[PDB]
Amino acid sequence: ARCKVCRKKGEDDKLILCDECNKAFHLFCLRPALYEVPDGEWQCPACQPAT
Ligand SMILES: [Zn+2]
Ligand SMILES: [Zn+2]
Secondary structure (H helix, E strand, O other), X not given: OOOOOOXXXXXOOOOEEOOOOOOEEOHHHHOOOOOOOOOOOOOOXXXXXXX
């Protein structure tokens, strides 16, 4: 629907909000390999650890 990165409707698969700071993100825009929901990484790249 919408996503704070691209701000575009198209790849409207299974969007994910970051729990911490409520940024709406596509699984694509979060991580290009990611297509299914991470029931754990309820995060966005900034919040996700450098590991
Ligand atoms: Zn997006
Ligand atoms: Zn975040």
